[PDB]
Specification:
The PDB classes it as transcription. Keywords: BET, BRD2, bromodomain, Inhibitor, Complex, Transcription, protac. The protein has 109 residues and is mostly helical. It has one domain (1-109). It has seven helices and no strands. Helix 1 (2-14) runs antiparallel to helix 7 (88-104) and helix 6 runs antiparallel to helix 7. The longest helix is centred in the C-terminal third of the chain and has 18 residues, at 65-82. The protein starts with a helix and ends in a 5-residue tail after the last helix.
């Protein structure tokens, strides 16, 4: 429970205005059709985004911190897999992942 509160705090931070300039692409599921990404679901087998993480947290789906972290990292990995490494969205992912990893490392234990 204490570790999951730390995870929820991280989640709220990732969704906060402080990080919105680079977090916003990750707020909602990638809408591949809307974006013209007709190969997205052939390349990305397990889509993930912060609204899905939030719903899972609210539903008490995550049983431990590692399960939460695996979903957040999956979200970033999907971005790194789909996009060329010099893409603007990848730069945004890297910045948001830096926020995540440094705070996640402070997990109470």
């Amino acid at each position: 429970p204490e570790q999951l509160k730390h995870c929820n705090g991280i989640l709220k931070e990732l969704l906060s205005k402080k990080h919105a300039a680079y977090a916003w692409p990750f707020y909602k599921p990638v809408d591949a059709s809307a974006l013209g990404l007709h190969d997205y679901h052939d390349i990305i087998k397990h889509p993930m985004d912060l609204s899905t993480v939030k719903r899972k947290m609210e539903n008490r789906d995550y049983r431990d911190a590692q399960e939460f972290a695996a979903d957040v990292r999956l979200m970033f990995s999907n971005c790194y897999k789909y996009n060329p490494p010099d893409h603007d969205v990848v730069a945004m992912a890297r910045k948001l992942q830096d926020v995540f990893e440094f705070r996640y490392a402070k997990m109470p234990d």
